[PDB]
Symmetry: D3
Subunit: 321 residues, 6 copies
Amino acid sequence: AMIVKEVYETAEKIKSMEIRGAGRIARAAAQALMIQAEKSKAKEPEELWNELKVASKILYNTRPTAVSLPNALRYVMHRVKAAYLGGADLETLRFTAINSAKEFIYNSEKAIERIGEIGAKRIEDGDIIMTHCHSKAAISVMKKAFEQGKNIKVIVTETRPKWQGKITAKELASYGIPVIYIVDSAARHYMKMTDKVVMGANSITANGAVINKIGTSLIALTAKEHRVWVMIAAETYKFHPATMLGQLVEIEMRDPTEVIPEEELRTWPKNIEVWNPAFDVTPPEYIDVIITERGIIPPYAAIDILKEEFGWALKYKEPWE
Amino acid sequence: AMIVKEVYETAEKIKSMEIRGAGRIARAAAQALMIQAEKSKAKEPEELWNELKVASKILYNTRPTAVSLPNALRYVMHRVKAAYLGGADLETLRFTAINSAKEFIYNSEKAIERIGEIGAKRIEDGDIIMTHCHSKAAISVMKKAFEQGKNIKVIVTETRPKWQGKITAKELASYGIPVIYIVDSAARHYMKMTDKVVMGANSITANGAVINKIGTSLIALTAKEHRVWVMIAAETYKFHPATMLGQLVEIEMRDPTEVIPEEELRTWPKNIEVWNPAFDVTPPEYIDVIITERGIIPPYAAIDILKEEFGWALKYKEPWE
Amino acid sequence: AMIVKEVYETAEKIKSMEIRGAGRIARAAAQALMIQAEKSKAKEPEELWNELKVASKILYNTRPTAVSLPNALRYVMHRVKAAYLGGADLETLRFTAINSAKEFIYNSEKAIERIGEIGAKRIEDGDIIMTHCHSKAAISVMKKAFEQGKNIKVIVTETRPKWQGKITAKELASYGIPVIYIVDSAARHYMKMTDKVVMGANSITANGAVINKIGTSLIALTAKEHRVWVMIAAETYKFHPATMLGQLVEIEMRDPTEVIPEEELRTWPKNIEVWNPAFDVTPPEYIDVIITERGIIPPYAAIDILKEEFGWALKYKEPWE
Amino acid sequence: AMIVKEVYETAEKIKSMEIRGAGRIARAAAQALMIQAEKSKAKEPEELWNELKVASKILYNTRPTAVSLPNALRYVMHRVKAAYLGGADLETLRFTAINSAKEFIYNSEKAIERIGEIGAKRIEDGDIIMTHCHSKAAISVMKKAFEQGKNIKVIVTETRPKWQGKITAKELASYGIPVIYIVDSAARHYMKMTDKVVMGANSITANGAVINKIGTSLIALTAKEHRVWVMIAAETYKFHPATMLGQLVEIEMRDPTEVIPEEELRTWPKNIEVWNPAFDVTPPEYIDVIITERGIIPPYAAIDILKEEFGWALKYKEPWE
Amino acid sequence: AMIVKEVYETAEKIKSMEIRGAGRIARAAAQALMIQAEKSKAKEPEELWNELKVASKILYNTRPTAVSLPNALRYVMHRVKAAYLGGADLETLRFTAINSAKEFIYNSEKAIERIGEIGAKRIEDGDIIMTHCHSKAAISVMKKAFEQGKNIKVIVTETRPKWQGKITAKELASYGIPVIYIVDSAARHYMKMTDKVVMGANSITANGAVINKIGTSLIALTAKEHRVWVMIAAETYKFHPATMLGQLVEIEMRDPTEVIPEEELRTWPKNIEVWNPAFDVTPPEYIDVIITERGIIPPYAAIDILKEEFGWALKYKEPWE
Amino acid sequence: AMIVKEVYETAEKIKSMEIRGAGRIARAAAQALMIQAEKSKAKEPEELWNELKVASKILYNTRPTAVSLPNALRYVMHRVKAAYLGGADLETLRFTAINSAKEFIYNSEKAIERIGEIGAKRIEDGDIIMTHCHSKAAISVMKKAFEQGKNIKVIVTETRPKWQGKITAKELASYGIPVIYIVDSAARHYMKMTDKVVMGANSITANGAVINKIGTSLIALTAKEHRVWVMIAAETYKFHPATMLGQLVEIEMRDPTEVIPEEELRTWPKNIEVWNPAFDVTPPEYIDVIITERGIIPPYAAIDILKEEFGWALKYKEPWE
Ligand SMILES: O=P(O)(O)OC[C@H]1O[C@H](OP(=O)(O)O)[C@H](O)[C@@H]1O
Ligand SMILES: O=P(O)(O)OC[C@H]1O[C@H](OP(=O)(O)O)[C@H](O)[C@@H]1O
Ligand SMILES: O=P(O)(O)OC[C@H]1O[C@H](OP(=O)(O)O)[C@H](O)[C@@H]1O
Ligand SMILES: O=P(O)(O)OC[C@H]1O[C@H](OP(=O)(O)O)[C@H](O)[C@@H]1O
Ligand SMILES: O=P(O)(O)OC[C@H]1O[C@H](OP(=O)(O)O)[C@H](O)[C@@H]1O
Ligand SMILES: O=P(O)(O)OC[C@H]1O[C@H](OP(=O)(O)O)[C@H](O)[C@@H]1O
């Protein structure tokens, strides 16, 4: 394990959330295996197979909740394993890693674009769209709907604690899309004026439940109370294979100082705990479609996305062990 | 109109929200009429009746949404008007103002205490209580339940944009009550662990709808989804007489810089608007009781609170015009 | 029983529905007792008390469902009975009938006006209002909201079988109020664009259930699904005293030829029955306020309207027996 | 483009709705391509491929909402295209069109029959069935349930504006099936006495939403409120492929004179608009099964009907362009 | 405290549930004070006031949940206290106790009869009525509806653990009323065939919640799911004054051997606990009316029953302390 | 048809419910065909094919509702038919029956184990689990969750009329799992303290509806009201193929003396009927996942379980006719 520096820097960027968003974290991790296999000072295949195994674990142990990341690594390492176990020279394996990781990064970019093309068709001229957090897939939809000539207006929820709504406001604002910026608490008060909800996903489960930024479940709840469509924009690599076998997705708890700043937090009584769930889970009865690069589906056909693509891997162990 | 300084300082403190909370704003305004009538350099009754009329308008025009304030002024000025129009000397009227405003301030303090006594009886040993904002009435309930020996734990929602949840956390924390501090978005994720919701009110309407800090409606929604009791703690002067005759309560929109700080806000594109509703409206089907100083009621008996106390005043004009 | 002609002509106009609408039917019936007592060729009091008793029964037996009618007659005949049983000359009783029936007709006109004043305050500039049938009380609200300067637009449901929506469209259209005319089936499809529902009542019960034109219950249902306010505009004489003692309101079934025309109906197979309920019942959980001349109430305070006004009469028999 | 007369006459019959019902419109259009290819005075293949392309567009541009029609044309023209582009003589192509259009017409008739066989098994002896409009598939179910010996009774909703319920009443009435005929507004009032709802479809979407005659959504709503099964009877060619890629189905607005007759309509104020949506959309949470010729499915497996049959065509363009 | 034997025998009969039903327990307790004051060997008033105080506590401490019992004692002892504290001879006080307890027993019998008269008017010819437990008030309604000529059929739920449904089946069966007897679990399966639910109450609260035999809440839930009316039949002395001041009603837990017999229970592992709540609480949103001797009310007007009758006593202490 | 004794004894044990539980009944029936083919005194193949056909019908006609049983027989007799109709000697066919029935019994045992492995992953440390009846699959989940180290506590509903909850309490109690034993009526009162519901199935339909012990539907209802997960544990052979073609599952009505004992029942009036449905049907909107040996699915993917495994058999007749 003579792991390159960039693998470590990616991992610490993922953890700190300097690199964030579940699509991007997955491309960043595939990027990090790519730069491993390129800069490897390795002589044998069996030495390279060890390096990528180890870089895979490092990058897996960063953040648990977005399955995009585990699937990026699997899409690389399923292939690299089958090459090694069939028997391949140094520059063949090195290639298979760089070329698997090339495919995935490209595939992600295609999927996000193709999601906007498909999602925008469900946005109508004049629509007010409420969103949450900063999702590239979700934003792909709104952009495309604006480019088509529809006069949308987007309500951006600020998305505490990490303020991702500021990112989202600035990004849409600067494509010409008008934005209304509200605190998260104001989501029911403005649900009446909203015509559609577009939000993203970190993981999607067997039964169609959507794991996504904290607060997603509440917006979906009140959307459902007012009969406003909740549409989840999500690449197929966001769907969670392990949930097919009864696994619950771990909900990451991030540092309390994101909520109350360190300087302030340390002055507070011992008998206040600050809890910081980064995600919540939204049931499928509150979601209208999931928009993927293969199409619109009801949330309940999550299980079919998972069967046809990821199901074969579950009788096997993980491909970096 | 030779209005005293303290009336102006109260009014600007109310507007800036250095004085906040609907019970307190009402006692602050009654306090401000009291210090007018004491420091008046007035010779005639008809000169005093003008001063208090004018101080009444100043204090009314501060903030629209909490009806506690209009009712504090009415409780003073209904009486002061009936004295003047019956015919009373300078020091008789001066007294009637100081002594009406004495009664109200005391009445408020009694009511809040008596609300805790009544509300705490609905809190059970071991309960987790979710609250919102900073409400003295609500806090009166939690305190009393702690003093009775029940081992509660309170989830405090941070209550953006003005961070009132920090006030609430520190205040309960320092009575020995453990606190769990979450962002507002995390309210559904923690509704499962919550046993009761206790929140306050700015206005309560004819039909039982509750106007309260932005986000109240969402917590009540999900509480109702999980069958957790929403209990609203509120003095009878929080109920809104004008709504008996079809008036909708005005929902105050406060400065966008409370949301995004000035320094930051001015750098943002012109095509982002920041909206800041200070309140939302929660329907009566999502509220289990309202706890007042006269008792528990279903939300629908709001109309009876209003009939027996404030209804007589509605065929008349306002008592400072 | 030498009953005047106008009593018979009113009764047949009420039955055929040439005179319709529950407020109007009640004023028409009070008008019919008035013209009895004026044109009476009667010598004794005891002869007059018989005539009005008999004209009361005739007018009661026209149509069962709108309680406005029974209450108009009661408001006349409670008084006329107490005069006779105390002992009064011919022209005293004659007067008491004409002057009770004067009061009621005036009271109705005041109430309807005062309902519009109170209801319009719940209509906001820009609102789209969905209505049903032709209700003078409901229309009073929309008119007043237009006169105040609000730019409303009203969706009129055609209101089969008797096409009352044509009346409603023409009446609002000709006050300058724009109208969108839809079939009754189109009510959910357009509930999303609707901001408020304003409808009237034939009877309101103890528990707050609203009896009104067939189709009211469905509009209220879907309004509730979309969280659009259902507001029922209704005079206090629309509330049903007998329901306080467990009586269900009879739902009138009118001639099948209103549905399918005679010429056509007679050609159809024997094994098709055409049913024609004139009314349906809408539960109080789907109604937001009832607007009356005394004020806004939650539907559940129906029982209080009934207690304070009509309850005393229920230990007694009917005042024309 | 020397298009035969019958293509034009079919198209104008489809538009006027002299030919109506989504199964029938699709067989009428396949019938119209059949009579084109038979009566063609064409010398070349490339001349015939032009004629059918042009007759296909004519018949497609009639009415947008029922996808049965586009799928009838596709089932013909997918095949005729593959013959031409492989290379086939005049009488080979002519045949492929006549023989594709033979298959479809037969397939439709089989499917409708087979739907009744499958649907009737969900109807129980004594059931009251509420229906809407005139659907051959729906009627196939009720007929078969009657033939099996079950003593049903059908509530026919009149189905304004075009009165399709008259068709439905007469058709069932004349198979011995008793019918109760109500206005559309009366659907909740009679939902309590109803045991099952059987209705048809114009289009069914990816996510399981059902597009069908205006008023379907309301009946389904109240059915769901009372827990009465809504069963949608629909051939697989009713399902909408384009919705797999995010397309919303266009909802046809038909002439306002269907609602208010011309003679009458022209006398009305300019400021009344008459809107006439021919269809509405019913969400899948309000539908219990969809009965197709391949079987019962939950509405959410719409996406699987679409994947296995129509999905291959969506990477391609339309087969008449 | 030379307490008579019959007071002790009543108390042990109440505890064992040989005397059961909340109306009856209250008449049994009033009967027990009556036989105290008649058989008293007391010389002074102050000796008699002690005896009845002590017999009152004995009878209060039997079973907590039915408030009928506390109100029977209060109706006796409010009066007996006011006599003593005004100053009355032995045979005056003795009388006031016997004559207060005479009134109450009679009042109960009138109320139950009058409840059937009022409730039966809401039962329609042909109705299937589901009931629970054995309630005299509820049974009063069904009897009266049968006597009026309506052809009802009653579904009796067996009402574990104490099998009260056997009592109910036999009692209705023997008035000619047909009965269908089901286990409690079968209540949803038969809710579709049910037209009305009639059940009784032990306590009714300020906010309209109904405490009644274990299982009431579930029947009410599914009734509400199917839109079947839940009607609660209950005397005004069933309503709970203390809940006006925030008191929760204690839910009695009875011996586990009622569930699993002693002989059997003692053989079971130590790590099985048998819990036996005698009651549950049903929210007011699931109840359609409460039928009392003063009339039908929505459940939310519980607070008004309590205000006008029992509210005066709550600033005072209990009248046997 | 020289049927062996054990086939008859199994059948009468199945009917009496000495052998019960839908997994077990299916293994008992496969066991009974196995012992037929082993003890057959048959000379020809065509004689053996008759014996197993006849033993198949006997075992099918025992109890209708659990489809596990029909599928056990089909899994045996699909194979035995294809052997015979291809042409096989006595000891070849005899084997094919014994070896098909070997596979199924083993497959069942694997499936139940594998269900616990998959289900337990959805149970979390500290969970309170409510169950119903006695289901081996459900119990497999709870056991495995206990073995993993999670500190669960199970609420066992007694499950009248046949007291299966006693079986369940004793079985879990004796693996160290603490149990709380309640009557069935107490299920809502304890739903608040419950974290998960785990229950089994007799049949699962095309649309995802679950047929299971009487009372399942009610627990699922209130679970859904409180947002507690309902998870159904069920082998793939529990899913019902015939429902794919519109068949409703027959709901078995068992002897009324299970409810009220014979000795007692015969003394009761003629006009009491005792109804005893053994099962009820729970809609898929109230079920969160179904846990099978192939995985977690949303209830709506029932149709996919059925398509891939049992669908091929439905164009054919039954394989013992
Ligand atoms: O992958 P895209 O669509 O861009 O974003 C998907 C989701 O990832 C983000 O989480 P975080 O910022 O990693 O905490 C948000 O939850 C967002 O909805
Ligand atoms: O009167 P008390 O019970 O203390 O507080 C009542 C309510 O007043 C506050 O509003 P703001 O802080 O004036 O904006 C919050 O909405 C709080 O719930
Ligand atoms: O009394 P107003 O408010 O005018 O009308 C009240 C109601 O009376 C009408 O019934 P009908 O036309 O008598 O059958 C409609 O139901 C309308 O909503
Ligand atoms: O295809 P079938 O089952 O016969 O009818 C299906 C549907 O087509 C009809 O529409 P229209 O009459 O074309 O406007 C109705 O909406 C009906 O439910
Ligand atoms: O007073 P009545 O209407 O007769 O019965 C009222 C209620 O009292 C009974 O309780 P228990 O048998 O004392 O445990 C049942 O809960 C019944 O519904
Ligand atoms: O197959 P397993 O999971 O063991 O049990 C499944 C179901 O079978 C039982 O029915 P019965 O006892 O045959 O009446 C219960 O309904 C139980 O939930």
